[PDB]
Amino acid sequence: ELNVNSAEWRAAVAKDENALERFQAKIVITNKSWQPIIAPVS
Amino acid sequence: CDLTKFRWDCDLPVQVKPSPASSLLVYCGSSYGYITKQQYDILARYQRASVNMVLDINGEYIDSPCIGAER
Amino acid sequence: FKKPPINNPSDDATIKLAEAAVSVSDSMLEMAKVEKVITPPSKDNTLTIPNAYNLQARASVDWSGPIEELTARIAKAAHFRFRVLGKSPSVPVLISISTKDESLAEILRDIDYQAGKKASIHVYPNSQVVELRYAK
Amino acid sequence: KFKKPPINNPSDDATIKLAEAAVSVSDSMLEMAKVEKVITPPSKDNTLTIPNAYNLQARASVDWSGPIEELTARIAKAAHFRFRVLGKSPSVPVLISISTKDESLAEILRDIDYQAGKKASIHVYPNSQVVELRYAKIY
Amino acid sequence: CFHPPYNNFQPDRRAVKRVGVDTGIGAVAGAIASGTASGTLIGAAAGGTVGLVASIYRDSKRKIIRDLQKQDIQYVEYGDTRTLIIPTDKYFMFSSPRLNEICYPGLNNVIRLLNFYPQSTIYVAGFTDNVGSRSHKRKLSQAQAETMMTFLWANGIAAKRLKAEGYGDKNAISDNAIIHGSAQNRRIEIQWF
Amino acid sequence: GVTQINGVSSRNLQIVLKGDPKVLISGFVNLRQLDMYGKGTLSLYWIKSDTLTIRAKKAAKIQLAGIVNRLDVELWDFAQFKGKYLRAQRSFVKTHDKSVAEISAVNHQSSLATDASDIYYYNLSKTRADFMAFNGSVLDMREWGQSDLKDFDRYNKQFP
Amino acid sequence: KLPCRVDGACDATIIKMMTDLNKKGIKVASVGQNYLISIPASALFADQSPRLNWASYSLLNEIAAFLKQFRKIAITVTSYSSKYVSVKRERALTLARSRVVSEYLWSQGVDSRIIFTQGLGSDKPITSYTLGGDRSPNARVEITFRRAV
Amino acid sequence: GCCSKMGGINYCDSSAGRLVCNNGFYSTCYCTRHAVMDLQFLMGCCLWHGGVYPQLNSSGLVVCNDGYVSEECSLQ
């Protein structure tokens, strides 16, 4: 049965991993990559 | 960077820790780094130009989109 | 050779109808301009992005319930300590966050804004603590 | 021969009645706007909450008659601004209808904020490149 | 004359094969028509010329593009940035990096087209639809892009010229909420200058 | 010849240039007519004029700052009129082959660029009307980043 | 009793007009549901000026018919040009060109809720051959949209 | 047909409501009634009033579901 005691509920927060605790470590924002043909589509 | 030529190829180093010199956020996908004011300005210029700025570490793609965040 | 607009008012009455619509839209906008109350950024009572590195981490939250549980869980995920200043109300302060990719700082901003004047959130990054301050 | 310059296309009495009613509505609305503005003039402009910046001066001709969030999100995406939402979206949608022609995105966002009024509010932070829509604390 | 699986990554010889067959048939026809050595030589020369023109047609870039479009591969040239879009649904084993070697004509055509630009820088990018986990889509697209890059490098392309990257459902050329759009989103893009 | 005048107060002034001098003036001037037929260069720091009439023919550089109630510029070839900061309530600007003018009209602006000519309006007049004949251009040249950049109205929106 | 297709649009018509525009020189490409129409600025405007030639209005009419053949939510008109005078000069010129083309396309009513307009000046060229003015390959107007459903 | 000058009708995509032709292009032709149609002129009495109230008529009056009498449909 659903419990109405909202104090007992347990929130769940997910996360996504960044470069934390990871970083020759050439961290670089590179534009040399694949580039879409139809670029400004909105 | 070189922004016109033909392929607009260029390189922006990223510093993970918020140094006083480089404290402007960049969200490379789910991984966020910090860069300088001039670097943020030219990143925003490339964003206006609608150029993919995937994050590369040691020549390896990690995360696709880069969007400027709070300064 | 240039062509005229396909929706051009070219009828003696359609033209008047169109200018009347323009005028009503203009007066609507003027009423809204007078009606609207705004909060200048200097006088905005809402959490500003704490800029703390651990808090910049992206997250994914689907919560609808008491503010205390989600705030404590967000703080623990951010590795900050968590504390509550004040007395919890009888009816709990219920908030909802349903986001797929939003940083912990922005989620805290949303939680504080939805709490409104019943509770507020402060973030101390030098001594990494999230404080939920109730209101009496 | 004898002529007078406005020789338009034929009009229908349906459009004629609609035109008369529309002009009456326009006159009533002008009187209403004038009396309310005199009663209490505005004191603050929303250009403070939506400050314009570069790439917010891109222009757009919009014709929209739906909920506010989708139009605001499209405007932000075209402005290369990250879109953020604050507050619980109410069950009754905040419908807006913007019909403009070649005006800047900052002006469009200002129009959207004014039309939303007490239901929703648009803010723009150009330092963080963030367009933020917040649904007011009613309910 | 040609091993169906990738010809052992060895150079392909349709030009020499076609000119040889054409010279053979021309020499046979000339010998039948004349019965003389000079007539046989004339027939062989006619076969050689017709084979030369036929191979000049069939080895052209336009014919290669027409063949790639007869196969399920799209070619787009905007300025001088040329892109080959190859559907994983047909050129990969289902939800696996494994190349679909039954579609070897298309892969051979892709390699041959990329051979026309010896100095170009090639980027291979993998894309999947919205179905699955974020990590799953990222990994699968990276794996398929890497497999395509390895095929390109094996068929005679330097390792420095190649970069392979795998986006998830991030950059979509179609609506994932509809079936055919979701299908169009499953592709590999090969871009070069 | 180089001229440097520091301090002028006049209720009328006429300048005609036929050579290639470098004259700069300071003070307040009620400039009325300006004629240039050679590769001259002229500058005025503050002017309070009611009706200015500028006619520049060949490679003449003009710079004026101040207020004007009715400005009328005619540039013919290679003539530069750096009229920015000269806020004219009414502007009548015409540029001919390969000439450049910068205008800052306030109330009413009327411009015509004939061929290979340029007009740049650094201010948004309450009403504007610009025409182009062969290859002439009339651009906005505003900052796009000013915190108070006024947008076009129903009465301002002219599409080139 | 119900429409069998979107009104005033045919597949044969779409193919024919794509072929005709590509033959003329206007590049009409389609990757997925995304459509791109690249127009050389020399076929629309004068020499580095935001003033269309009167003859280019037939081309704009064909492009308007092509846009009307699809259902969509937002088109985008972007302008690029070769460097002539200054960064602000080319940016203003390209914005004005995008404004004017967008205004004409809007007047020739297309099934588009939003028509975004922008000009980056000389930011994203598509060809290393930068020699030339408006005849240069990377001086163009890009009309990009996504077919809706 | 529908997918003319393309390959021809490949299949009806019910998620989008349109036909998909033998090339990758969609078709302008709908294939299910749930396709997004720009239906603006809808026939029928008592629109915007709940529809016609299903009662055996004693007079020519056509009464809508909310009580309003559709004068444009009633007999004269």
Side-chain angles (χ1 to χ4, degrees):
Chain A
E1 58 168 11
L2 295 137
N3 64 335
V4 280
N5 301 20
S6 40
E8 305 177 357
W9 302 346
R10 223 218 85 88
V13 175
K15 282 166 63 181
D16 304 320
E17 83 145 358
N18 79 285
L20 189 41
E21 319 287 356
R22 307 203 263 107
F23 301 116
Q24 195 39 254
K26 203 199 89 186
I27 330 168
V28 151
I29 300 179
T30 294
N31 90 68
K32 282 154 303 253
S33 87
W34 170 87
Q35 300 285 342
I37 302 90
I38 334 293
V41 166
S42 187
Chain B
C1 298
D2 205 80
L3 184 270
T4 308
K5 46 172 315 307
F6 140 75
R7 204 36 166 67
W8 347 287
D9 38 42
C10 95
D11 180 350
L12 276 87
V14 200
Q15 311 188 348
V16 303
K17 213 52 42 183
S19 47
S22 323
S23 34
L24 310 201
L25 266 158
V26 167
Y27 273 87
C28 312
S30 303
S31 58
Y32 52 94
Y34 294 57
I35 52 161
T36 60
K37 301 240 189 32
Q38 156 182 331
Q39 282 173 332
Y40 184 175
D41 286 353
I42 185 146
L43 180 85
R45 194 152 156 258
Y46 270 92
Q47 246 186 297
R48 270 181 250 123
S50 208
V51 166
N52 199 3
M53 299 279 273
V54 301
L55 160 60
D56 287 357
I57 290 165
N58 290 322
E60 266 220 44
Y61 159 97
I62 264 54
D63 261 335
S64 165
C66 287
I67 296 171
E70 270 211 344
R71 294 206 193 187
Chain C
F1 59 114
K2 168 176 195 153
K3 278 154 92 71
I6 38 62
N7 238 359
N8 209 17
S10 213
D11 294 5
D12 273 296
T14 303
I15 301 191
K16 231 188 167 195
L17 217 169
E19 337 182 299
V22 168
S23 178
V24 194
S25 76
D26 180 19
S27 301
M28 270 328 162
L29 181 51
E30 206 205 312
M31 187 212 335
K33 215 183 303 280
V34 172
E35 224 62 72
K36 169 137 209 91
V37 84
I38 88 164
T39 326
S42 85
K43 286 173 242 143
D44 209 338
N45 273 324
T46 284
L47 207 150
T48 166
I49 300 326
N51 120 95
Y53 185 94
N54 275 14
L55 276 169
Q56 321 285 39
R58 306 279 233 175
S60 174
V61 153
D62 183 281
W63 173 254
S64 167
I67 176 173
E68 275 205 47
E69 196 25 82
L70 184 52
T71 311
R73 215 54 45 186
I74 284 270
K76 197 206 46 203
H79 291 119
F80 285 31
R81 285 132 296 271
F82 171 75
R83 78 152 80 77
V84 168
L85 170 75
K87 42 168 60 173
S88 165
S90 34
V91 152
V93 181
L94 301 149
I95 55 104
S96 100
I97 315 274
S98 311
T99 201
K100 294 286 209 344
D101 221 45
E102 200 158 317
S103 59
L104 304 174
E106 302 181 22
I107 294 170
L108 285 168
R109 207 171 130 68
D110 201 334
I111 291 168
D112 153 38
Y113 159 98
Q114 299 202 24
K117 78 182 28 63
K118 303 216 278 291
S120 147
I121 285 143
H122 310 82
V123 172
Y124 317 118
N126 35 71
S127 52
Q128 306 162 120
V129 160
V130 165
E131 158 145 90
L132 171 68
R133 191 171 309 179
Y134 274 119
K136 63 309 190 183
Chain D
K1 285 290 289 291
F2 297 93
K3 283 198 171 185
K4 297 172 206 168
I7 299 137
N8 283 319
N9 307 143
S11 314
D12 268 334
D13 55 358
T15 325
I16 288 165
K17 294 168 207 230
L18 287 164
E20 309 165 355
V23 171
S24 184
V25 168
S26 146
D27 281 351
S28 296
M29 198 93 207
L30 267 168
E31 237 289 330
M32 188 261 144
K34 162 186 311 306
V35 47
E36 175 145 349
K37 164 161 226 184
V38 157
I39 283 303
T40 179
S43 308
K44 261 152 264 201
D45 220 356
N46 84 324
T47 168
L48 313 153
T49 68
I50 311 185
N52 97 83
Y54 207 108
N55 85 28
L56 254 196
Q57 290 305 319
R59 315 188 73 78
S61 320
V62 316
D63 165 82
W64 200 273
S65 192
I68 179 177
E69 185 160 341
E70 182 161 2
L71 176 55
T72 313
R74 290 206 178 259
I75 294 304
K77 181 154 85 88
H80 303 296
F81 274 23
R82 166 166 83 266
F83 185 46
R84 174 163 82 219
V85 182
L86 253 73
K88 295 165 274 191
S89 173
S91 184
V92 200
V94 180
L95 308 168
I96 75 174
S97 160
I98 320 279
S99 198
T100 74
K101 190 165 124 303
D102 188 301
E103 92 175 47
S104 80
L105 290 178
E107 264 324 286
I108 301 177
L109 288 177
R110 278 147 188 168
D111 293 2
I112 286 155
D113 187 2
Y114 274 145
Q115 181 145 0
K118 324 224 161 194
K119 318 159 146 199
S121 300
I122 313 282
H123 300 242
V124 160
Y125 310 96
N127 278 351
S128 34
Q129 300 185 271
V130 169
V131 164
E132 176 189 273
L133 158 59
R134 40 171 88 165
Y135 306 90
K137 296 226 52 54
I138 327 178
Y139 305 118
Chain E
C1 75
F2 166 57
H3 299 89
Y6 312 167
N7 202 32
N8 323 134
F9 306 103
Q10 221 74 337
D12 167 66
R13 304 254 156 281
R14 333 196 275 265
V16 319
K17 187 191 173 314
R18 280 189 168 120
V19 301
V21 176
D22 262 310
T23 63
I25 54 176
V28 162
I32 282 297
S34 61
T36 65
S38 59
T40 292
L41 173 61
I42 294 301
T49 58
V50 70
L52 259 158
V53 308
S55 279
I56 283 271
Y57 169 12
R58 304 277 188 203
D59 277 323
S60 71
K61 227 179 317 193
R62 169 173 108 211
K63 179 60 177 191
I64 292 187
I65 264 63
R66 193 177 334 300
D67 277 294
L68 276 146
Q69 213 222 15
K70 262 177 239 218
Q71 286 118 45
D72 265 17
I73 295 183
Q74 187 188 19
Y75 177 67
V76 154
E77 193 203 328
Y78 190 35
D80 56 7
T81 302
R82 311 162 164 78
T83 294
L84 276 167
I85 308 175
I86 299 120
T88 66
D89 294 5
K90 313 275 279 228
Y91 284 89
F92 279 75
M93 309 283 188
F94 165 79
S95 191
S96 66
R98 299 179 49 224
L99 227 59
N100 189 306
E101 337 166 317
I102 295 199
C103 282
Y104 68 91
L107 307 168
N108 290 348
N109 269 335
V110 163
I111 283 305
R112 182 139 23 64
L113 176 56
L114 276 151
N115 275 343
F116 272 124
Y117 316 86
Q119 259 97 38
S120 51
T121 298
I122 300 107
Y123 311 76
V124 202
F127 300 100
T128 79
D129 49 47
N130 76 304
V131 186
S133 201
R134 176 178 299 173
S135 67
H136 155 241
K137 294 169 313 206
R138 181 189 78 77
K139 292 196 243 185
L140 172 77
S141 59
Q142 182 81 61
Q144 298 184 313
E146 159 162 8
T147 294
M148 185 47 80
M149 141 175 76
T150 299
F151 182 69
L152 302 190
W153 152 93
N155 263 81
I157 287 168
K160 52 207 194 348
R161 291 170 45 190
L162 279 169
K163 183 186 195 3
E165 31 194 302
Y167 314 79
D169 68 333
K170 294 215 191 81
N171 294 347
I173 59 164
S174 282
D175 195 6
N176 279 309
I178 64 192
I179 284 288
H180 187 63
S182 200
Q184 259 150 199
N185 274 334
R186 305 189 285 261
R187 83 213 174 276
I188 300 272
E189 302 223 13
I190 293 187
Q191 289 212 335
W192 70 91
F193 313 169
Chain F
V2 162
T3 314
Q4 206 281 338
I5 320 170
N6 241 326
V8 167
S9 69
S10 79
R11 305 302 77 100
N12 188 44
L13 161 44
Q14 223 271 359
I15 305 136
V16 161
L17 257 45
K18 207 105 181 60
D20 326 296
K22 268 77 204 172
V23 41
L24 67 100
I25 314 176
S26 173
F28 299 92
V29 161
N30 195 302
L31 198 45
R32 191 170 296 164
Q33 187 170 25
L34 215 178
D35 291 327
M36 291 227 189
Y37 308 110
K39 316 159 196 40
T41 293
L42 151 70
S43 168
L44 277 89
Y45 294 146
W46 300 126
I47 65 176
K48 172 151 46 187
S49 162
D50 213 82
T51 299
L52 241 183
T53 298
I54 305 206
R55 249 67 173 179
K57 195 69 69 168
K58 273 158 69 177
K61 302 195 282 144
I62 315 157
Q63 165 171 309
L64 323 169
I67 46 186
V68 153
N69 274 5
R70 181 154 177 158
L71 166 50
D72 182 23
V73 185
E74 179 65 290
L75 308 186
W76 288 100
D77 60 79
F78 294 106
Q80 313 176 13
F81 170 59
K82 200 153 312 300
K84 170 183 49 187
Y85 321 128
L86 179 62
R87 304 170 58 84
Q89 313 294 283
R90 180 97 51 154
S91 276
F92 277 96
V93 184
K94 196 172 300 177
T95 48
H96 281 265
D97 35 40
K98 278 146 211 154
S99 64
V100 152
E102 300 168 13
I103 77 194
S104 309
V106 161
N107 274 7
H108 316 269
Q109 166 189 303
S110 311
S111 315
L112 164 66
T114 319
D115 49 350
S117 36
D118 292 327
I119 313 172
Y120 306 135
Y121 48 94
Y122 287 66
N123 200 26
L124 198 51
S125 57
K126 299 197 192 172
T127 310
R128 162 182 67 94
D130 324 307
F131 290 85
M132 302 134 162
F134 283 105
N135 298 307
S137 98
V138 195
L139 290 328
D140 200 8
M141 323 297 285
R142 296 225 289 286
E143 274 321 301
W144 301 13
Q146 307 191 35
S147 33
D148 52 18
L149 189 94
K150 261 179 186 288
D151 203 47
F152 299 89
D153 279 312
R154 180 165 300 280
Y155 334 112
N156 275 324
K157 269 195 227 307
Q158 304 271 140
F159 293 105
Chain G
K1 40 167 199 43
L2 281 174
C4 83
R5 49 152 168 93
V6 302
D7 67 318
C10 292
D11 310 77
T13 292
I14 288 176
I15 289 309
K16 149 144 288 306
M17 317 184 324
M18 283 212 257
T19 291
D20 285 350
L21 290 184
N22 280 313
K23 276 180 187 181
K24 280 165 199 157
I26 323 295
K27 164 167 188 60
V28 182
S30 162
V31 162
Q33 282 166 220
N34 294 352
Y35 291 74
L36 165 86
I37 325 163
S38 181
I39 312 135
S42 75
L44 287 180
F45 295 104
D47 204 327
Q48 309 232 44
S49 81
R51 172 195 94 81
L52 290 89
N53 301 54
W54 197 258
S56 83
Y57 275 110
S58 47
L59 170 60
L60 266 193
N61 277 314
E62 276 115 16
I63 296 179
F66 184 65
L67 286 163
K68 284 194 284 191
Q69 280 281 312
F70 306 100
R71 203 182 269 134
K72 71 214 93 67
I73 307 175
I75 329 180
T76 326
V77 185
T78 318
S79 325
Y80 315 87
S81 74
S82 67
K83 318 199 184 85
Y84 186 41
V85 166
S86 77
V87 49
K88 287 174 53 73
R89 206 264 180 198
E90 318 119 339
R91 276 177 206 281
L93 159 67
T94 49
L95 175 58
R97 292 174 150 173
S98 80
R99 280 176 80 230
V100 179
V101 180
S102 169
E103 145 68 2
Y104 185 73
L105 293 182
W106 182 269
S107 99
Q108 299 311 115
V110 295
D111 192 290
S112 173
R113 306 276 74 71
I114 320 175
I115 302 192
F116 295 111
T117 81
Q118 59 207 300
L120 305 319
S122 35
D123 278 2
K124 184 206 278 315
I126 60 158
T127 289
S128 269
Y129 190 66
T130 84
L131 303 321
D134 268 6
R135 333 279 299 153
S136 162
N138 37 21
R140 76 207 172 284
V141 190
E142 261 178 2
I143 319 186
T144 76
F145 63 96
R146 151 170 296 186
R147 195 177 183 167
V149 167
Chain H
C2 270
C3 296
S4 56
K5 264 196 230 142
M6 296 160 178
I9 303 174
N10 194 51
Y11 79 98
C12 156
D13 183 21
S14 292
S15 34
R18 287 178 187 261
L19 289 172
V20 184
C21 311
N22 274 320
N23 52 339
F25 285 85
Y26 268 101
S27 200
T28 56
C29 289
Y30 312 127
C31 72
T32 166
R33 77 167 64 252
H34 291 106
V36 170
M37 336 197 168
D38 202 12
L39 290 196
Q40 299 296 332
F41 193 179
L42 249 54
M43 309 179 167
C45 291
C46 284
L47 279 194
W48 308 115
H49 285 299
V52 173
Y53 176 49
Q55 45 102 345
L56 274 179
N57 61 86
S58 47
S59 63
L61 254 59
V62 164
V63 181
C64 310
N65 258 252
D66 51 23
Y68 178 109
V69 167
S70 170
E71 184 146 359
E72 317 97 58
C73 293
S74 302
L75 255 285
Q76 302 160 56

